[PDB]
């Protein structure tokens, strides 16, 4: 396999380079425009406010930027992200390895505790997932059996029926854990269907960019809602674990 | 299993709620720090610049925030969708790290990211298992010789296996944890605490995105900026084994 790993490694590099070219192509024009918009705003501010040097307005933007970066809101001049609800949810984002990061640890104690909380938490959750996975597989296969038997009742071949069940499994899962949530979130978060799918997939892949987070909205008086979703994550991850492993095996087959 | 899963589930829920209490305790005190900092800046600025109304400084901060939201950067390269940074971003997808220190702005970008990640994470997963075993066998070949020195002091060989495997995940730890923490301490101007936090947040694939090496070549050692993806890939393999060993131990107990 040593030759094939160099081949596989090179393929992954190409995959990244092809991803890189596509992402730049799609994203960089808007990034350049934001930069131009920031510049247009400074030049207009200087023109309006003679008592402000280019370089002084430079510091303002830098210092504003740092504070926004640490989660300050432009809209207000006030003065909970760590209410028992969100704090639980934050702990959830760790052990799941999703790690949205939409709220950051500011204390050295917070970070040090997070190092150990994760090192113990992630594998602990890994065990629960395997558990929920095995239970879920057994549960749906037993359930699929009854309607699987109805196809067998109309005299269809056994080797055909396993694959039909396998395909049927994928459809059931998607409805329950992909499309339903996208429709759920579409309504609850006021996102587009594509924003919602993007969130769902980014979540169940455990990537957790944190650009989109269900419940996070400061306005909503829905703390019970946020953990409710975390039960979707628990159930969802196991479904997507299967999907990811199976498409990996598909890639093995193509290889 | 029936008892096991519901017991284990309850244990995890307890763990989460106890985690929650700890975090809130340490982090709720400082919730408003960034809002306080923005305020200190606005007032300090009005005091310094009498020709600016509080309301005029107000619009500026919103208009700046929307620019930064578009991915503008305070300038005083630096493109996060230049080929280097974009490579690294794609990297953050397949690794499932997903820092999000730079987010996708376009609907097309997100849509592609879906199929990319969907066909990319497993592809990487395959190679990782690959590079895990390959390095595993290569280090194991190294392990056997180290086992020989322990064997020629008449230490029972099963202890040598554990002792060597203990040494395995310690030499790897020094190589992949300590080196980067020292490197990052120097290179990123972080504390060794901030560096270990970054390293472990990275290698656990949590990838908060509060701390990022950046893989953006700047000056003096640009080579090393993208290379750290090397450390990540190699590290994730070592950490993969570390994660399983800890998990296996928890299963055992």
């Amino acid at each position, epitope marked *: 396999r040593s030759t094939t790993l160099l081949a596989l490694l090179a393929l992954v590099l190409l995959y990244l380079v092809s991803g890189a070219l596509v992402f730049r192509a799609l994203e960089q024009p808007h990034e350049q425009q934001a930069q131009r918009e920031l*510049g247009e705003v400074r030049e207009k501010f*200087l023109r309006a406010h*003679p*008592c402000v*040097s*280019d370089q*002084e307005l430079g510091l303002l933007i830098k210092e504003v930027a740092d504070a926004l970066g640490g989660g300050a809101d432009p809209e207000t001049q006030s003065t909970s992200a760590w209410d028992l609800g969100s704090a639980f949810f934050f702990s959830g984002t760790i052990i799941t390895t999703i790690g949205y990061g939409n709220v950051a640890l500011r204390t050295d104690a917070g970070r040090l505790f997070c190092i150990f909380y994760a090192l113990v938490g992630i594998p602990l959750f890994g065990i629960l997932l395997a558990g929920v996975g095995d239970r879920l597989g057994s549960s749906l296969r037993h359930g699929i059996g009854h309607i699987e038997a109805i196809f067998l009742k109309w005299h269809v071949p056994p080797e055909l029926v396993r694959v039909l069940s396998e395909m049927l499994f994928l459809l059931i899962g998607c409805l329950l854990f992909v499309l339903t949530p996208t429709f759920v979130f579409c309504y609850m978060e006021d996102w587009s269907k594509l924003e919602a799918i993007y969130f769902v997939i980014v979540t169940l892949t455990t990537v957790g960019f944190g650009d989109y987070v269900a419940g996070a909205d400061p306005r909503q008086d829905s703390p019970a809602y946020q953990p409710l979703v975390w039960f979707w994550i628990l159930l969802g991850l196991a479904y997507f674990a299967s999907v990811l492993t199976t498409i990996g095996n598909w890639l093995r087959v193509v290889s | 299993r029936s008892t096991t899963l519901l017991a284990l589930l309850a244990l995890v829920l307890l763990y989460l709620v106890s985690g929650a209490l700890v975090f809130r305790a340490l982090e709720q005190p400082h919730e408003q720090q960034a809002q306080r900092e923005l305020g200190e800046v606005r007032e300090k600025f009005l005091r310094a610049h009498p020709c600016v109304s509080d309301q005029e400084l107000g619009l500026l901060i919103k208009e700046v925030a929307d620019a930064l939201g578009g991915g503008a950067d305070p300038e005083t390269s630096h493109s996060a969708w230049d080929l280097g940074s974009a490579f690294f971003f794609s990297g953050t997808i397949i690794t499932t790290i997903g820092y999000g220190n730079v987010a996708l702005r376009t609907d097309a970008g997100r849509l592609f990211c879906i199929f990319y990640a969907l066909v990319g994470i497993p592809l990487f997963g395959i190679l990782l298992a690959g590079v895990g075993d390959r390095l595993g066998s290569s280090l194991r070949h190294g392990i056997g010789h180290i086992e020989a020195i322990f064997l020629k002091w008449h230490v029972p060989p099963e202890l040598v296996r554990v002792l060597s495997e203990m040494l395995f995940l310690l030499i790897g730890c020094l190589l992949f944890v300590l080196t980067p923490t020292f490197v990052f301490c120097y290179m990123e101007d972080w504390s060794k605490l901030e560096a270990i936090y970054f390293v472990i947040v990275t290698l656990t694939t949590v990838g908060f995105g509060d701390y990022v090496a950046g893989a953006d070549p700047r000056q003096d050692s640009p080579a090393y900026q993208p290379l750290v993806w090397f450390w990540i890939l190699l590290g994730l393999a070592y950490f993969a084994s570390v994660l399983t060993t800890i998990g296996n131990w928890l299963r055992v107990v």
Partner: antibody
Amino acid sequence: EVQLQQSGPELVKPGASMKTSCKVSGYSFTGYIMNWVKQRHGKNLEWIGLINPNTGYTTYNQKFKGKATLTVDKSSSTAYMELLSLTSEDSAIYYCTRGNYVFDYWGQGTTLTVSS
Amino acid sequence: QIVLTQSPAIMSASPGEKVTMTCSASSSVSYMHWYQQKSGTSPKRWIYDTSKLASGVPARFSGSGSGTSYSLTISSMEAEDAATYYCQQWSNSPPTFGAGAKLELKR
């Protein structure tokens, strides 16, 4: 009418330092940024640096970092530029000029001669 | 660090000639300003923000352009228009000028 009146022409020995002066009038000194520009016979007009007379905030052209010290007297609404360790390369006309994007008002200029 | 290029460095116009001097930016600039300077006197803000005339600049003078190319234009050259014209820029610290365009009178 805005007016920048600089101090008169200065002759100093090589190595010596020199301070010139720009008294503004017809507006408020502290309201607008003060810059200094160098003009020799053989080069482009060169921005030396600026001061915010209200804050005392200064930035310099990298080329002049060590050479020039900008200061104001708010009470006498006078801007000062100091040039250090003078070489014949510093023999030029120096202007003070007002502006944060365009230099809208200029002094009459002052001619520095570095000579033994 | 942006470089502005005025070429030719020197030019001549018979009275009534339309004159156009150009200023090239090394990288893209939002606005260009211009200064007129007659020997012995300081430079006077002539055009600012690319196409705006200063207090008493006669209307026969126009500015124009965008990106990395800007132009000062005289509809009809007059005697008193003979002077050095400099383009400056502050879309980027530090501000910079052209080496200048001396406009002589043809006779």
